[PDB]
Design a protein around this ligand. Sequence first.
Ligand SMILES: Nc1ncnc2c1ncn2[C@@H]1O[C@H](COP(=O)(O)OP(=O)(O)O)[C@@H](O)[C@H]1O
Ligand SMILES: Nc1ncnc2c1ncn2[C@@H]1O[C@H](CO)[C@@H](O)[C@H]1O
Ligand SMILES: Nc1ncnc2c1ncn2[C@@H]1O[C@H](CO)[C@@H](O)[C@H]1O
Lengths: 275, 547, 126
Amino acid sequence: HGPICTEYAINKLRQEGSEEGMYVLRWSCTDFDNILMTVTKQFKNFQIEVQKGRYSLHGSMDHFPSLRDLMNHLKKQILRTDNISFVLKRCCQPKPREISNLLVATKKAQEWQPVYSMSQLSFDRILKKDIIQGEHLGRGTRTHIYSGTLLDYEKKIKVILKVLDPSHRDISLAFFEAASMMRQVSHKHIVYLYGVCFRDVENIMVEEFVEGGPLDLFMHRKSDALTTPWKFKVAKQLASALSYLEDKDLVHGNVCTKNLLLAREGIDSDIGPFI
Amino acid sequence: LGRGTRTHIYSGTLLDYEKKIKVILKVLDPSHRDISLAFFEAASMMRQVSHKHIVYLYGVCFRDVENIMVEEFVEGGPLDLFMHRKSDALTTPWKFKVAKQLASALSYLEDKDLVHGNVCTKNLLLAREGIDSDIGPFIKLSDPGIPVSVLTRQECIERIPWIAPECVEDSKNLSVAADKWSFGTTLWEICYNGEIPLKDKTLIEKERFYESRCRPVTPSCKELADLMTRCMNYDPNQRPFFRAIMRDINKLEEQNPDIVTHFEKRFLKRIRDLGEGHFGKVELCRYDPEGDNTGEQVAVKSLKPESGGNHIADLKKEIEILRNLYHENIVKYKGICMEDGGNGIKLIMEFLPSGSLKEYLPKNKNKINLKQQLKYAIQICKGMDYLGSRQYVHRDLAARNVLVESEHQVKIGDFGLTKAIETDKEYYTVKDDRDSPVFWYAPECLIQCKFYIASDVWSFGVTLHELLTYCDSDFSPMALFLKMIGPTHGQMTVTRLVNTLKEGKRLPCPPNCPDEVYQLMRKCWEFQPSNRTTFQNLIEGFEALLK
Amino acid sequence: ETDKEYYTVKDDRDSPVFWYAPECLIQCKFYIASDVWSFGVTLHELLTYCDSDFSPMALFLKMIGPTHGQMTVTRLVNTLKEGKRLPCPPNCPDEVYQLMRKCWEFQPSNRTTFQNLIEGFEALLK
Ligand SMILES: Nc1ncnc2c1ncn2[C@@H]1O[C@H](COP(=O)(O)OP(=O)(O)O)[C@@H](O)[C@H]1O
Ligand SMILES: Nc1ncnc2c1ncn2[C@@H]1O[C@H](CO)[C@@H](O)[C@H]1O
Ligand SMILES: Nc1ncnc2c1ncn2[C@@H]1O[C@H](CO)[C@@H](O)[C@H]1O
């Protein structure tokens, strides 16, 4: 790390568990040729001199050519400190957009601060008379999906409905915070949820329908016709979608080909497919 | 703490919110999970409110399938019984300030365009007493609860006069204007010591009252009558506003120097499961209307939600057949608790901590001598003889159904299977499809559904074989019959049972059974009911055994 | 199994008791001759076109009087030991009835084989 204040790094040690063996490296706020490490209850600091690209610990007559060469060397020894002794086990690394003293607070960047929803779920209900249940489409992971059509939202719009399996109503929690977490997302590469439906005991996520279908069998069918820029753009757009997802501190544990659904074909012409 | 409108409430305590704070939890009834919607938008609507006269909800709890509203606890309790208890000590400024603060709370409610369809004394909970000193009591408004829009048509008529006739005509006509009607109803209620309004009036009479467009109730004061008529308007759009009510009451309070055998589900404190059958379930409950845990433990029988109407009628029959019974060796009946809509009924018996002989005997090996279970047999014979003299056949005479009241007395229960015989027949024929103790029945009771008073002699003999052997699982008539009939299988069992019985097979001599006891005892299972003994003869023989 | 002449049931499951041979009701013993009884019941169903009015359920019920769930198999066994069987189906030929009633002999050893049934039926074709 750079010249980050002591309180920041001390707090960082608390979050992981403050177990003996961890350590954090950051540049000394006063000296350009010295790195300081904080080890950890006790919190011991240690300084290392870096001269002419050569690395060595203060009080030690030996020297090492690389910082990694230096720090790897001390991995296999015991450290004596007054009466207490310990062995380092693991380092600490930076985190995305980690708030610290080096950052500058501005009015325009304030609007981009993430919202606080640690214990909040919001969702919109869909009246049971506003939907039409259609034919089945296949059973998912403890989930059944039928054909759907929404009315009075234009009107008579085909939608996708998903029914949680009655054998697993105990997991209606994950059901709820999965239906809720998609309310906050807003990107062209993500599905659109009109809301949730309530009747009797079962429930439905009314999601966007796309005729393109999943890319799995699509790619399975015309492999010989595929091109290289095709997969380049396919990868880059889903990578951008994942960057958007991580930009809102949200997790998607099902990043797979089965969760990649095509929108447009574009194979025949210069236009690119959409997923 | 007591059952609400399809809701159960237990004691609660929240941790790591200070810590170790007592809270109030409310559990929606599993029989009505279909109404989890109104549940949800009732739990949500209280998130937006913020006033000192309203409850505080810490949130909602999730686990398995059930859910809980964690609400604020107050030791003051509801104002209903509070006002009931010290009516003679009440004062006029007391009710003035009580009315004005709840009116201010209702104005706050209408200021946020929210509806509360349960403005009643039962939803008024006290916070501080203040009677002794100049400080005034504090009350706070509770949750709206289940909406009336889902109540039955019958359930829409018991809320009279608290319910507005507009919602009665159509539930869709609900609006904030109906809150003033409940407000005026409560105003009248607090003016007469909380007396039940429109009591001694049938449902049809209340409907006639609404349709006749007559005044529901009148006070004895001119100004009170004026203000009530001003707030008791059949036109919802003509009802004046709350701030007008506050100004009127503030004017008048200075203008007037002169001051002038049923059980409630809310008082049923369930403790622990007492007994579950194929169609019904018995719970252990404490009836504590005072809320001080000084109530009386009672045994309550209930039916599972998926029970049919035929089983409902069977249960009702159970009530009336037991109601006219009165004997020292039978379960005691006290009253009946009604559920909302008339679709549910609770049967209340006596809870005996001694339990039944099935459980009492195994834990009491050495303290019963032969004389004691001989007395028990005398008691059971007397109970059946009383029942037979009333032309009833219990049809479920089992030691598990023989409740114990003391080490000198037992009682008989589980009368859900008891049937009366008509005045011009010698037996009864069963029609209902229900599991039955086939091992406790006489051969005719297995072959032709024919049940006599001599049939209960067979059941008594089985129960005595149970009793003298101290109700041993090792010697259970279930297992004894099973082993004497070989490996049998469910539907198969009764067949081979009949086969062996026609072969002259019976239960063996119980351990250490005296020869005279065995002789009189085997007399009970003669094949022909006409050749079977009577319970008067059994009592005579047993008492001779005492001599 | 390779060294037995029948089978004994242990699992607790609802079973078509009206379709079973007397040993299948009394001792859980199920033979290949046991399926001859079931075939005869099914043929009584088939020739009568599977009539609800002539259902073996209802036919047996009415020949055994008013019975009741757990009670039914008892009286069923009683009547069967009395020599009672399902009646002649409507318009059933005399030879068809003769070969057909052969299926419900009380002793499984005295019950016919399905090869014999096929032979008799094909002779009926001729
Ligand atoms: N008054 C009572 N006191 C104590 N236990 C009771 C009482 N009434 C019923 N029970 C318990 O309920 C269980 C079942 O009761 P019973 O009415 O015999 O059968 P069912 O299961 O049909 O209700 C028994 O084990 C008995 O211990
Ligand atoms: N979220 C979805 N959007 C569009 N189509 C879907 C979705 N989930 C499943 N399908 C359709 O279901 C079928 C396979 O599950 C395919 O026709 C696929 O297009
Ligand atoms: N919301 C509530 N806050 C405080 N006490 C309550 C509440 N609901 C019920 N109770 C208590 O339950 C009992 C009667 O239901 C009384 O002791 C009453 O105080």
